Amino acid sequence: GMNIDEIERKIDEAIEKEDYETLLSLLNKRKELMEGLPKDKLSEILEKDRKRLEIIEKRKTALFQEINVIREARSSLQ
Amino acid sequence: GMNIDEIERKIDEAIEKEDYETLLSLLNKRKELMEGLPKDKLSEILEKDRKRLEIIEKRKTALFQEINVIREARSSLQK
Numbered sequence: 001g002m003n004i005d006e007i008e009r010k011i012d013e014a015i016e017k018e019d020y021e022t023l024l025s026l027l028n029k030r031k032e033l034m035e036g037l038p039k040d041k042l043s044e045i046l047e048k049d050r051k052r053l054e055i056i057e058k059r060k061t062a063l064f065q066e067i068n069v070i071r072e073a074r075s076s077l078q
Numbered sequence: 079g080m081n082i083d084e085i086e087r088k089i090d091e092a093i094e095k096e097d098y099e100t101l102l103s104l105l106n107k108r109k110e111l112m113e114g115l116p117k118d119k120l121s122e123i124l125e126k127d128r129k130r131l132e133i134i135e136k137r138k139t140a141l142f143q144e145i146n147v148i149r150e151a152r153s154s155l156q157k
């Protein structure tokens with residue numbers, strides 16, 4: 001078993017490497033440990049998750065920008 | 079400026095490197111030359127363009143897959 005702090009560290013690593021499938025699995029592993037945490041640690045993990053979500057939402061808007069440039073190229077190839 | 083052969087080569091280089099802004103620019107430069115080309119070079123270019131469309135469409139689909147997994151991660155984060 002990995003401890004909460006060790007999964008927390010892999011979660012941020014996954015996010016940085018833009019490895020979202022691995023992130024998914026870590027969050028699902030973390031889901032088991034969530035119910036037996038003290039309230040202060042839980043609240044800091046949830047606060048941290050807001051910041052994590054800000055990171056991937058910026059990555060998502062960048063993917064949409066790159067998709068759109070390919071749409072321009074596609075029109076220009078046609 | 080550059081001739082058609084050099085542009086076509088840089089175009090394939092831009093596709094490989096995911097440099098779609100440079101592709102756009104190169105395609106604009108090519109569109110000026112298109113009118114003057116022989117019918118044989120035009121058809122060569124149209125054929126290449128098909129394969130090129132396949133490559134960037136495959137890459138656009140890959141990006142959407144990333145977006146789709148990202149949406150799942152958000153859900154799992156938003157509990």
Ligand SMILES: [Ca+2]
Nearest residue numbers: 019020021022
């Ligand atoms: Ca992975």
